[PDB]
Design a protein around this nucleic acid. Structure first.
Ligand SMILES: [K+]
Ligand SMILES: [K+]
Ligand SMILES: [Mg+2]
Ligand SMILES: [Mg+2]
Ligand SMILES: [Mg+2]
Ligand SMILES: [Mg+2]
Ligand SMILES: [Mg+2]
Ligand SMILES: [Mg+2]
Ligand SMILES: [Mg+2]
Ligand SMILES: [Mg+2]
Ligand SMILES: [Mg+2]
Ligand SMILES: [Mg+2]
Ligand SMILES: [Mg+2]
Ligand SMILES: [Mg+2]
Ligand SMILES: [Mg+2]
Ligand SMILES: [Mg+2]
Ligand SMILES: [Mg+2]
Ligand SMILES: [Mg+2]
Ligand SMILES: [Mg+2]
Ligand SMILES: [Mg+2]
Ligand SMILES: [Mg+2]
Ligand SMILES: [Mg+2]
Ligand SMILES: [Mg+2]
Ligand SMILES: [Mg+2]
Ligand SMILES: [Mg+2]
Ligand SMILES: [Mg+2]
Ligand SMILES: [Mg+2]
Ligand SMILES: [Mg+2]
Ligand SMILES: [Mg+2]
Ligand SMILES: [Mg+2]
Ligand SMILES: [Mg+2]
Ligand SMILES: [Mg+2]
Ligand SMILES: [Mg+2]
Ligand SMILES: [Mg+2]
Ligand SMILES: [Mg+2]
Ligand SMILES: [Mg+2]
Ligand SMILES: [Mg+2]
Ligand SMILES: [Mg+2]
Ligand SMILES: [Mg+2]
Ligand SMILES: [Mg+2]
Ligand SMILES: [Mg+2]
Ligand SMILES: [Mg+2]
Ligand SMILES: [Mg+2]
Ligand SMILES: [Mg+2]
Ligand SMILES: [Mg+2]
Ligand SMILES: [Mg+2]
Ligand SMILES: [Mg+2]
Ligand SMILES: [Mg+2]
Ligand SMILES: [Mg+2]
Lengths: 116, 146, 206, 65
RNA sequence: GACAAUGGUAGGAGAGCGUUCUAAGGGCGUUGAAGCAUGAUCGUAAGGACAUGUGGAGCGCUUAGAAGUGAGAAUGCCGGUG
RNA sequence: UAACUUGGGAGUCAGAACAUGGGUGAUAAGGUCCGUGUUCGAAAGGGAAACAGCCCAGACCACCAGCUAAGGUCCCAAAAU
RNA sequence: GUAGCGGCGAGCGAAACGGGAAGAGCCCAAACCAACGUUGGGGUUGAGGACAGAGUUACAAAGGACGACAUUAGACGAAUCAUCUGGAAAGAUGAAUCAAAGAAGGUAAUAAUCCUGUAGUCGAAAAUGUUGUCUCUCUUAUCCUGAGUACGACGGAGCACGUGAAAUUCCGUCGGAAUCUGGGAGGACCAUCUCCUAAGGCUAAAUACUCUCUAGUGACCGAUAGUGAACAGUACCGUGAGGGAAAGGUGAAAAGCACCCCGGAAGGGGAGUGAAAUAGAACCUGAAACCGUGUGCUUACAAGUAGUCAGAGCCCGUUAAUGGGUGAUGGCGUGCCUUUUGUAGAAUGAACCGGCGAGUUACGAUUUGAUGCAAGGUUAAGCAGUAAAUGUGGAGCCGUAGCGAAAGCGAGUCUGAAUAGGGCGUUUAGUAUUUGGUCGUAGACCCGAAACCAGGUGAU
């Protein structure tokens, strides 16, 4: 029996084109360049799911450094003092406390200074 | 079973490998042939035994011997095969072929001395080994070259 | 082993002894599958063909010179990548039939018959008394015997009036003792066999 | 069609009980003054086709039993 | 439940997805099949549904069988259009 | 924690840099030919501005958790003016 | 794929026996007779001859009479109504009927009972064929036995066989026998033995093929497929030989749009037909590239493989999901394929979209899985059967024993003076079919040369 090409080709290519939605010009229209961009999009997304954790740790550290300098202390000194005092609050929570409850962050800084 | 519930025996059937159908099969593109060279080509590859121009083994070795046009080969029966018949039976080539011990008669029937006879028989054959004749005679029976 | 023997009116005429070696064995599903596949393959007519590049009409000359035109090199307008070109491989006529050892064939027949004897799918009639072909009367007989839609009717020899009476009812098929085959038996849900046919089946399948 | 036996090979080997191929020896035609007595005596003795050569040439002698 | 392993080209091994046809069984369809279009749906992947619109007569599912069975590249072929 | 034997199936026979023992060249070459090791090839990630072959280190998937390696902590640009 | 042939390379490759289909045997020349060397008789062979019921299918060739059958037109041929949805019922539901007929088409959707049909049965004025009975005729070792032959030499060829130890067959040139006490063959040749009887002819059947015809079939195509050709060897190209396309589909029914309006027309808007007209003929469905119209978010200080991760603002509201669209701004980020030591590469390839486009099949080999049987396993052709399964068919094939170049011997054997040593063996498992892998022969995964040969067409 003969198997014609049929509809599977169109269905698969349409899936790729739909994934390419919002891309510039031919990249949301033509299957070949859409497929190339979607492959790149996957590779980028994998890499960036990794890099985003570093990015947000970087942001938290920057904010903690600013708060510590407000309390006359460097980030490195503050973190060493917290470690010596046995406080395991991570950098996300530390930055969020420094933003929200300034008095609680001041208490944490005082404990860090005491441990040193 | 039922025609709507057929099942082949376990392990009796395996799907064939189809090359050149995409990367994920692991046999896409080059279809298992590697890259370039004579063996990558359609119809490519040297004849079996070819050694790339080094003298082939079956040219560097010498021919030996000859085939005898009048060579005789016998259907051989051993004593342990002769055990099948009961005591007092006269064994003939026709009897052997009938009972199925000998399938093809060839140039004749030769009795050989492997195994133990344990029966008394009158064995009529075309050839006997010395041990076969001695064992037949020493078990109480007799043999005759016919 | 022991089987009831009925009249065409349903009355239990008597009893028959059927060899366990024929109707009583444990069916060999592997061999039965192989036999069904073999019969189905033998039914195939492999009359299918295509025209390869040699067989397509025309296409002798080179379409254009090897070099200098700026086009891909081509050798004939009937090459496979050309519209209207030859087919690469594709179907070519051949038989699909293959053989199996005779002992395996017999084991398959016994497996099908024993599967019928198990599952209470076998019934023995005393005789068939059709002197003239009458489809309605045969349908009445089947209804009285209380048979399912798919029935295989087995007679000792070629019974023309039984065959003519039964051959128009959908799902009913009539065969002889020598004509029994795995496809027919497995397709049927019930076997209606005469006593003489059953005796012959026992005699030949042993 | 039927595969064809390699006739020269069939003229040069014989098949043993376990499936090995018995072969004659090279350097046994002439120039015997240039070879020691032990050399010729031991060249008189047959060998088997090696395993690697067998991997190469098995199909040439498939029908030869 | 507690331990271990899981980058990968040529390449070896395994398990699967989907396409057309066939057999048997069981079903859907003018109260609207296939196909086409859209969607914010589902599965580890190939891919599978559902709803709506279009369409106007065929088509799924289960098991098994068989293949002209899967294209993005061949200065590929034909057609259409930039 | 392999090793060996027997069978089925391969691909490979253009290699490259770096370090080191040497030939050749001119103690020239991102040269060439051998020995030894690593990496690339077939290896993403961090460092060396960028930079196959150097340094750290081998990505089953997810996380807006933590500790480190090489390399770093004035600003670009995370961390010591 | 044996024996053998073979730069003993690549390769080439029998036959006899055995099993089957089919089956069939005959006529002359010559010896010798009687008629005018030519005619009739005589005879046909492995020893015979001289001498002393068969037939127009060969075996001789012409008719008739009649019968029967077949083909070339045809005929009859069972059985269904209702409601529902629908434009339409064959569909759904209910209740029936026929069947030697439930093959298949058609009918306003899917029908055994509506139609054409099917099972079954019948039918021929005439013409071609086949086949019968009667007839019909035809008939009831003295001598010879194929001479420019056999055969030989030389040169070739055909034989599986390449000149070989080359028998056997044929051609050219040249030579050139014998005569049943004969002649030929048995693979150089001689002898013996065995078989046969050349140099004359005829002969059905089992076998080969398909432009055709009739009747049918398909896990064959379904409009880029299948014939090149569903509407063509046409159009078109070429001096010519020759090459050689594209192109199917309204609707159930033409009911194919009366009439009005703008317009020269084309084309439209209504109105009508139709179930439907975005079914209006360039007519089923109507994808993508590509071209337009409208606008929710956004954009004129910005350096870019166009995304991705983070993220306000604005606009919406879903297969209801820790939603959809857009996106100020920040981080990261040199397409894909091929080929390469190494390619963002300024190396290759692709304008885009769509369709088409590449490890297949047959026969062998080997290996593995599966299954059946097991010291056994298994049939091939054929015959029967429905183009089937299957039954029958044991010829043949592989195993049950190997070793040796061989004669041979044999659980051993070969080497060897050896009772030595050593090689290969013994010290049970095979076999048939088949899925998968791989190899061989085939074009053998697909496309591509420059060229070679053969037969033709061209001096417009
Ligand atoms: K005469
Ligand atoms: K000659
Ligand atoms: Mg089709
Ligand atoms: Mg396609
Ligand atoms: Mg990290
Ligand atoms: Mg691979
Ligand atoms: Mg590719
Ligand atoms: Mg390549
Ligand atoms: Mg290479
Ligand atoms: Mg290679
Ligand atoms: Mg080729
Ligand atoms: Mg051709
Ligand atoms: Mg890993
Ligand atoms: Mg992996
Ligand atoms: Mg594989
Ligand atoms: Mg698979
Ligand atoms: Mg599948
Ligand atoms: Mg294909
Ligand atoms: Mg292309
Ligand atoms: Mg270098
Ligand atoms: Mg250097
Ligand atoms: Mg080195
Ligand atoms: Mg490489
Ligand atoms: Mg790296
Ligand atoms: Mg490595
Ligand atoms: Mg640098
Ligand atoms: Mg960097
Ligand atoms: Mg890299
Ligand atoms: Mg730290
Ligand atoms: Mg900083
Ligand atoms: Mg009727
Ligand atoms: Mg002669
Ligand atoms: Mg003669
Ligand atoms: Mg179409
Ligand atoms: Mg066509
Ligand atoms: Mg075609
Ligand atoms: Mg429409
Ligand atoms: Mg249309
Ligand atoms: Mg601006
Ligand atoms: Mg500015
Ligand atoms: Mg950047
Ligand atoms: Mg280079
Ligand atoms: Mg550029
Ligand atoms: Mg190139
Ligand atoms: Mg280009
Ligand atoms: Mg394309
Ligand atoms: Mg191949
Ligand atoms: Mg194969
Ligand atoms: Mg190989």
């Amino acid at each position: 029996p003969r198997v014609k090409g049929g509809t599977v080709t169109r269905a698969r290519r349409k899936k790729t084109i739909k994934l390419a939605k919002g891309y510039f010009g031919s990249k949301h229209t033509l299957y070949k360049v859409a497929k190339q961009q979607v492959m790149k999009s996957g590779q980028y997304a994998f890499r960036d799911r990794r890099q985003r954790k570093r990015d947000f740790r970087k942001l938290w550290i920057t904010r903690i450094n600013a708060a510590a300098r407000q309390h006359e202390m460097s980030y490195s000194r503050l973190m060493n003092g917290l470690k010596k005092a046995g406080i395991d609050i991570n950098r996300k929570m530390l930055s969020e406390i420094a933003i929200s409850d300034e008095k609680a962050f001041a208490q944490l800084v005082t404990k860090a200074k005491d441990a040193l | 079973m039922k025609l709507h519930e057929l099942k082949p025996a376990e392990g009796s059937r395996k799907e064939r490998n189809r090359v050149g159908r995409g990367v994920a099969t692991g046999n896409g593109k080059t279809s298992g042939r590697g890259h370039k060279g004579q063996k990558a080509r359609s119809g490519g590859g040297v004849r079996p035994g070819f050694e790339g121009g080094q003298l082939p083994l079956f040219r560097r070795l010498p021919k030996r011997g000859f085939t005898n046009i009048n060579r005789k080969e016998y259907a051989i029966v051993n004593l342990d095969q002769l055990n099948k018949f009961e005591d007092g039976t006269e064994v003939t080539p026709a009897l052997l072929v009938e009972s199925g011990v000998v399938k093809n008669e060839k140039s004749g029937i030769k009795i050989l001395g492997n195994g133990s006879l344990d029966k008394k028989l009158t064995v009529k054959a075309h050839k006997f080994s010395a041990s076969a004749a001695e064992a037949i005679d020493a078990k109480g029976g007799a043999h005759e070259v016919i | 082993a022991n089987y009831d023997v009925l009249k065409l009116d349903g009355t239990k005429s008597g009893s028959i002894e059927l060899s366990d070696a024929v109707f009583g064995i444990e069916p060999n599903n592997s061999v039965l599958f192989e036999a069904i596949n073999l019969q189905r393959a033998s039914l195939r007519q492999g009359t299918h063909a295509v025209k390869n590049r040699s067989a397509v009409s025309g296409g002798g000359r080179k379409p254009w010179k090897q070099k200098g035109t700026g086009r891909a090199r081509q050798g004939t307008i009937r090459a496979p990548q050309w519209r209207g070109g030859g087919i690469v491989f594709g179907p070519t006529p051949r038989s699909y039939a293959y053989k199996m050892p005779k002992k395996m064939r017999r084991l398959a027949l016994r497996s099908a018959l024993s599967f019928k004897a198990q599952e209470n799918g076998l019934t023995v009639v005393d005789a068939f008394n059709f002197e003239a072909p009458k489809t309605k009367e045969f349908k009445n007989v089947l209804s009285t015997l209380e048979q399912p839609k798919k029935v295989l009717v087995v007679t000792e020899n070629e019974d023309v009036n039984v065959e003519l009476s039964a051959r128009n009812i959908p799902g009913v098929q009539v065969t002889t003792a020598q004509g029994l085959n795995v496809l027919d038996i497995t397709n049927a849900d019930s076997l209606v066999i005469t006593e003489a046919a059953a005796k012959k089946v026992e005699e030949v399948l042993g | 069609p039927k595969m064809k036996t390699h006739r020269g090979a069939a003229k040069r080997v014989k098949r043993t009980a376990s499936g090995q191929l018995k072969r004659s020896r090279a350097f046994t035609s002439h120039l015997f003054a240039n070879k020691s007595t032990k050399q010729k005596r031991q060249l008189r003795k047959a060998r088997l086709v090696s395993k690697s050569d067998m991997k190469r040439v098995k199909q040439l002698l498939a029908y030869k039993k």
